[PDB]
């Protein structure tokens, strides 16, 4: 390779890969995007450990060494970061398109200093709530532009996309179709068809709105649906996009006008960073003269809105802080350097303490070392006082697991190996079912209903885990979460068993729509869960391999691939092809093509026909049109639009390329 | 199951080819037995017999139909509660007990029982090994075993054998194993070649039934 | 030790599904496999020629204990008849048999020193 692109979690592991192999000399530079996540995040702390580890290593050799290029938004303590990394600093306020941040109260629009800049009057009045939200969107569209409309909840976005699209139908004509006849009639049709041929299908609300250049966008949608909408909006096919805060931190997506519906997001006042990420998407370089931002408020929330327009970002925290003498991030940082073998003695530990971002701002370290000693993570030998890794230590590092989590996992696995159920895959799935964060709001009454209907083989697994029927009843009768007490990890257990059931149907190739109706969770939450469990399953497998647990490793090593695509064991071979997901793999399997080998000798036009059969239609489906011989109705990654013929031809070509590399 | 005798006429055609008929009913009784124990199917083209999954599995495993019944239940029993921390429980499933490979000294057995680690005592209980029966073996040499439910004897004999197979695949010297258990090197070597074959059978049997986790 | 009624197995399997968890634990702890109950409804194969097929008596015994449970739970004779499918004659003959047997097992436990069990 030359350039490896990683996320934060994956990059930190790769660095650790380089420490065990001493191939640190391969790495020439690291580029960090969004440097403000150094401060506070679910994973933002990994960015510091990553950088600090580099700063500690480059110090042990103290012509060029390791270069660091970091970039972010305007931070108050930005000079502190450049000094910590011994980096030269640069800061600018330049912006090719001037941003006009404003706030609307009633009909009046004010700037940051509460001076009136426009008295707004709606060109055609419509009914509803109407803080001139539709009229504002209409004004932008008429000037042949596009508008981003940010809403608090997922439900408002769909409701608003519906109102706007509905009014767009009445007003243009002055009184679920085909797109109007312009130069783009073909591409609006291509978008809906691409949505149709997806594991999710074509959303009911989108079928109404998309024909009129209107759409919504939130985390409830699948990642493939969101890739389509973002592309459509970026091309101009969609003129109005009602989104959530998910997009504001997502990919680069600019617009002429940005509208924020309210300064109250999720029942709480809006964060400043979120605000700057929304209004930052106003103004297209090379297209617009200005970018306008409008924050709609009332007189009551009037004062709070101005606070955002004048507000500024908070200083970057270290995420390694001391009430408590010990902290998770510190324990982990120390584990990586001792087990990795770059900090052995006691003097090296405090040398590392100098390289931290925490010390750049101007004991606890010794407390973390003892913690690693108490929990058998690290060893001390009598050449006075030198610290070494244990098997539990070396296992934890290679698994990329958190030392705090490793303790409960290690005990739980030993518990499973004393009495294990093998007749189904449920018990194995439970061991690789992640529960460090909530992926959905579980309806407990529904849960209890599935409990009664649950077969005996899976009830045995429930009991073997910790699931008491009494607790499930005490969840439905009273919404008492309790969980203040630490031993009330009892809550996580029932949440974990609920999740494993979902993962069971998922690898049982149950349709996303059935699973949504059965459990009551959207397709967005499911897909986010499987990508989490696929990663976690790999960790527990590595953890079992480094501990010598062969029997346990043997059972786990098949669920990482199955959780990823959501398939059964038979389709594991087909899904090696890039274009083949769960659905396409099944219909090709049911038609005689079981392996890549069977797929390389395959006739292209036959594959094309089989693909046409896996598609979901609203009428019980599955004109001689010689105009659809060229319709690009198949989506890819880094994509050119693919026709059903080209996709079929690519699959057979790819199958052939893989088969040859196997010999 | 092999598919060379399908109908009822073919069965008696086979009866003519036997060595038993060369010397010059019962066949029909065996067919019903295969029906009662779900080994074979009967469809309504009157009266044609077909193999089940249990049938096709038994044939491919080269197992005796009489033995297959107890094996099929025992495996289902193991999959309801299985110990994975050691290889003992797995070895028990592939430990053959259709013939005696040695004369077991029960007093020695009880001595190894007390010294046995907790992880392997859990496997003993999970199988059927009661400490009371081991004591009743040392005190009095009462084999009993006239009653059919006294397959209880085979269980303790089987668990004794699995211990031997455990040390064997743990690369313990043949001389240590001889002194520890009290069996000659001839009996041990004859046992491992028997268990190697049986282990392959149970693996095939598990594969044809779709029991992937167990096969693995 | 004797059959007190002709048990309808399909009805039995229906009561099995509706059975609370506390009583399913007792069923498993005894020998009751759900697979065997299904193989009773699908095919009326009694087998029981083999001695180890005392497995039949176990499911028959657990069926009977359910009846005795409702009986000492003061459930009307008419409900029990409709629920299980046995006449009032067979039930009453059963309880007088179980009352005697219960006394035997109690004495048996007392003479062996099993105080906790006797209690
Ligand atoms: K793929
Ligand atoms: Mg950026």
Residue numbers in the entry:
A (entry chain A): 184 to 245, 256 to 368, 375 to 521, 524 to 563, 580 to 599, 605 to 844, 851 to 891
B (entry chain A): 540 to 563, 580 to 599, 605 to 776
C (entry chain A): 658 to 776
The authors write:
DNA polymerase theta (Polθ) has been identified as a crucial alternative non-homologous end-joining factor in mammalian cells. Polθ is distinct among human DNA polymerases, exhibiting not only a C-terminal DNA polymerase domain (Seki et al., 2003, Shima et al., 2003, Yousefzadeh and Wood, 2013) but also an N-terminal domain exhibiting similarity and motifs typical of superfamily 2 (SF2) helicases (Singleton et al., 2007), separated by a long and lesser-conserved central domain of unknown function (Seki et al., 2003, Shima et al., 2003, Yousefzadeh and Wood, 2013) (Singleton et al., 2007). The Polθ helicase domain (Polθ-HLD) is a member of the SF2 helicases, most closely related to the Ski2/Hel308 family of helicases, which are involved in the ATP-dependent 3′-5′ unwinding of lagging strands on replication forks (Tafel et al., 2011, Buttner et al., 2007, Guy and Bolt, 2005), thought to facilitate replication restart at stalled or damaged forks.
We determined the structure of Polθ-HLD (residues 67–894), in a complex with the non-hydrolysable ATP analogue AMP-PNP to 2.9-Å resolution, and with ADP to 3.2-Å resolution, both in the same crystal form with a single copy of Polθ-HLD in the asymmetric unit. In the nucleotide-bound complexes, AMP-PNP and ADP bind in the nucleotide-binding site in a similar conformation to that observed in other helicase complexes. The adenine moiety is hydrogen bonded to the conserved glutamate of the helicase motif 0 or “Q motif,” although in Polθ-HLD the adenine moiety stacks against V89 and F93 rather than the conserved Leu and Arg residues common to the RecQ family. The α, β, and γ phosphates are in the equivalent positions as found in other helicase nucleotide complexes with conserved polar contacts formed to resides in the helicase motif I. The electron density for the AMP-PNP molecule is significantly weaker than in the ADP complex, especially around the adenine and ribose moieties, suggesting only partial occupancy in these crystals. Comparing the relative orientations of the D1 and D2 domains in the apo and nucleotide-bound Polθ-HLD crystals reveals a modest difference in relative domain orientation (maximal displacements of up to 5 Å), which would place the ssDNA-binding motifs slightly closer together in the nucleotide-bound crystals. Analysis of the nucleotide-bound crystals reveals that the same arrangement can be formed from the crystallographic symmetry operators, suggesting the tetramer is unlikely to be a result of crystal packing interactions. Comparing these profiles directly with theoretical scattering profiles calculated from the Polθ-HLD tetramer crystal structure reveals good agreement between the experimental profiles and the Polθ-HLD tetramer in crystals (χ2 = 1.60, χ2 free = 1.80).
